[PDB]
Amino acid sequence: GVVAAAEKTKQGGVLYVGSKTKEGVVHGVATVAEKTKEQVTNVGGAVVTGVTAVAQKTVEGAGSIAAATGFVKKDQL
Amino acid sequence: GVVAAAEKTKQGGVLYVGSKTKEGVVHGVATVAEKTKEQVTNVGGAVVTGVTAVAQKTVEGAGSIAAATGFVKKDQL
Amino acid sequence: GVVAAAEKTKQGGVLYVGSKTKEGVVHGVATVAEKTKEQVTNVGGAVVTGVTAVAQKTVEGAGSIAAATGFVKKDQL
Amino acid sequence: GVVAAAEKTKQGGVLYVGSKTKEGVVHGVATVAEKTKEQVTNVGGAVVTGVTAVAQKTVEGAGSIAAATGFVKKDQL
Amino acid sequence: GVVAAAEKTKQGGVLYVGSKTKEGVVHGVATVAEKTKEQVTNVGGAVVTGVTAVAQKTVEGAGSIAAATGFVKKDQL
């Protein structure tokens, strides 16, 4: 009887300026794994099998990497 | 009887300026693993199988890495 | 009867300026593991299988790494 | 009958300027492990299987690492 | 009958300037482990299986490491 849940129940001269804002938001990620089988053999690389939630407002810079999941970087400068 | 939950129940001359704001927010990540089997063999790399939640407002800089999950960096400068 | 929960119940001339703000916030991460089996063999790399919650307002600097989960860095300068 | 919970119940001329703020905040991380089995063999690397909560307002500096979970650094300068 | 809980119940011309602030705060981390089995063999690396909560307002410095959980540093300068 497995379950994952994210709920927002709401049973029942104002001025808003630049308010009630959502910028770079992750909301409500539900994940279930039941009776799964994984075998990972990794030599020198990247393996991601889980849950990744990234929320960013601002990332700035030349040659930057903002969000990287399962990433191999082998550059030659 | 496994369960993960994140709930926001709300049973029942204002001025907002730049208020009630969400910038770089992760909210409500529910994850269940029941009767799973994992085998990981890792030689010199990166393996991520869990839950990763990253919330950032601002990341600044040349050649920066803001959020990295399962990341191999082998550069030559 | 396993359970993880994060709840915000609320049964029942103001001026806001830059207030009630959320910047770089992780909120409500619920995780359940029941009757799981993990085998990890790691030689010289990185393995992450748990729960990681990172909340940052500001990270600044050239060549910086803000949030890194399961990360192998083998650069040559 | 295992349970982890984080609850905020609230049964029942003001001026806010830059107030009621959340900057770099982790809030409400609930985790349950029941009848799990882990085997870790680690030679010279990093393995993280637990719960990590990091909350930072400001991290500044070139070549800095703000939040690192399961991290192998073998650079050559 | 295992349980971990963190609760904030609240049954029932002001001026705020830069007040009621949360900067670099970890709040409400509940963790339960029941009938788990762990075997760790570690040779020369880092293994973290527990609960880590880090809350920092400011970390400053070139080449600094603010928060490190399960970290192997073997640099050559």
DSSP E29-73: EEEEEES-EEEEEEESSEEE-SEEEEEEEEEE-TT-EEEEEEEEE
- Give every CB contact of residue E18 below 8 A, 6+ residues apart in sequence: D17, D18, D19
B and A make contact (3+ CB pairs below 8 Å): yes
Query: Which chain D positions have a beta carbon within 8 Å of B4's beta carbon?
Result: 30, 32
A residues 23-62 closer than 8 Å to B (CB): 23-62
CA distances from B38 to A69, C48, E51, E73 (A): 20, 13, 22, 28
E37: distance to nearest CA of chain C, Å? 10
Experimental method: cryo-EM
Closest to C48 in 3D by CA, of A43, B37, A47, D48: D48
Among the partner-chain residues E1, E12, E39, the one whose CB lies closest to the CB of D1 is: E1
The long-range contacts involving A69-72, CB below 8 angstroms and separated by at least 24 positions, are A69/B68, A69/B69, A69/B70, A70/A46, A70/B69, A70/B70, A70/B71, A71/A46, A71/B68, A71/B70, A71/B71, A71/B72, A72/A45, A72/A46, A72/B71, A72/B72, A72/B74
Residue in C closest to E8 by C-alpha: C8
Residue in E closest to D76 by C-alpha: E76
Q: Do C6 and D6 touch (CB under 8 A)?
A: yes
Q: Residue B76: count other Cβ atoms within 10 Å of its Cβ.
A: 11
Contact (CB, 8 A) for C49 and B49: yes
Q: Which subunits sit against B, judged by 3+ Cβ pairs under 8 A?
A: A, C, D
Residue in B closest to C2 by C-alpha: B2
Closest to C21 in 3D by CA, of D3, A33, A22: A22
Residue in E closest to C11 by C-alpha: E11
C and D make contact (3+ CB pairs below 8 Å): yes
Contact (CB, 8 A) for D69 and E69: yes
Residues of E within the annotated binding site for Cu cation?
27
Q: Residue D9: count other Cβ atoms within 10 Å of its Cβ.
A: 15
- Give every CB contact of residue B40 below 8 A, 6+ residues apart in sequence: A40, A42, B47, B49, C38, C39, C40, C41, C42, C47, C49
C27 is annotated as contributing to ligand binding: yes
Closest to D66 in 3D by CA, of B3, B39, E63, B25: E63
